[PDB]
Design a protein around this ligand. Structure first.
Ligand SMILES: O=C(Nc1ccn(CC(F)(F)F)n1)c1nc(C2CC2)ccc1Nc1cncnc1
Ligand SMILES: [Mg+2]
Ligand SMILES: [Zn+2]
Length: 313
């Protein structure tokens, strides 16, 4: 119980900030995750030997893809850590445990293809689950790793509590289906504006946790411009691979996935920021006012993409 994790001074300061980048040293990401769980939860919540074994099985089942990789996993967990630390009274001891594991696991075994490519390709996973295809896969990968010998980080919980935390995790991982985000944000907006939003209603919590997951998942659009710019090259590399695989099936891809249309990218990001990211972080700031630095950093990047369009960079 007396084995604290420390970080170098710059990381220890900078990790509390929403805009933190976890850096290029893979070998430090686990200790970064353990440090975040230990401060977010308490040093006790997880048996350190089990956590570490769980972290490394999770790392093993992320693939070597440009964007939806191990680094994205720990990045999305860091964003959740920032949110939880700036809203510390709002969430239960179980939610804090669950949400950081959810974020770490939310993209397990991702191959860099969307749900619609799975459907067009006729992948087996699309037969198993018609909606939220990859996301139900990501959850079942989480359950798999949890059922490996010596990996049950939730062993200490009652049957009841274990069921509650697996259901937080399932809803949280499903909520990273951006198709679901649109209605979910729409309903939260309506509930907030009419003043019916009530964080004691469990179905209202679920929605707010869903919006948090979208926010954490998109958080590469809320970093400092140089990090957002380089991370965008990563997601577009998957997009263009997927477009390539669309052409292989006899299907003209949408322009966003078409690498012959690299020129359209800056205008593509305007679209994305206006239609997804700005509305996401606006609604989140309304519900959780301490999350405002994510909205501010998102607006700055939107304005950086406008400068790109106008030849100013
Ligand atoms: O850019 C993304 N999605 C786009 C682009 C164009 N459209 C069409 C539109 F605009 F209608 F939505 N959608 C994007 N998507 C995602 C996931 C939902 C797929 C995550 C990050 C993303 N971006 C990014 C930028 N910088 C640094 N990291 C990630
Ligand atoms: Mg995903
Ligand atoms: Zn993700």
């Amino acid at each position: 119980g007396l084995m604290q994790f420390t970080l170098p001074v710059r990381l220890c300061k900078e990790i509390e900030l929403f805009h933190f980048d976890i850096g290029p040293f893979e070998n430090m990401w686990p200790g970064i995750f353990v440090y975040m769980v230990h401060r977010s939860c308490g040093t006790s919540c997880f048996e350190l030997e089990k956590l570490c074994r769980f972290i490394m099985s999770v790392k093993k089942n992320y693939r070597r893809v440009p964007y939806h990789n191990w680094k994205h996993a720990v990045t999305v967990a860091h964003c959740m850590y920032a949110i939880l630390q700036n809203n510390h009274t709002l969430f239960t001891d179980l939610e804090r445990k669950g949400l950081l594991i959810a974020c770490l696991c939310h993209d397990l075994d991702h191959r860099g293809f969307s749900n619609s490519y799975l459907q067009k390709f006729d992948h087996p996973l699309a037969a198993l689950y018609s909606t939220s295809t990859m996301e139900q896969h990501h959850f079942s990968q989480t359950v798999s790793i949890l059922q490996l010998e010596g990996h049950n980080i939730f062993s200490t919980l009652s049957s009841s509590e274990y069921e509650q935390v697996l259901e937080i995790i399932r809803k949280a991982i499903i909520a990273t289906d951006l198709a679901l985000y649109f209605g979910n944000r729409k309903q939260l907006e309506e509930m907030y504006q009419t003043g019916s939003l009530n964080l004691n209603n469990q179905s209202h919590r679920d929605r707010v946790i869903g919006l948090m997951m979208t926010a954490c998942d998109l958080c590469s659009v809320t970093k400092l411009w140089p990090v957002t710019k380089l991370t965008a090259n990563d997601i577009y590399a998957e997009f263009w691979a997927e477009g390539d695989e669309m052409k292989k099936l006899g299907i003209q891809p949408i322009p966003m996935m078409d690498r012959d249309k690299k020129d359209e990218v800056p205008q593509g990001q305007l679209g994305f920021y206006n239609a997804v990211a700005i509305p996401c972080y606006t609604t989140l700031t309304q519900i959780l006012p301490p999350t405002e630095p994510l909205l501010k950093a998102c607006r700055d990047n939107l304005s950086q993409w406008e400068k790109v369009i106008r030849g100013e960079e």
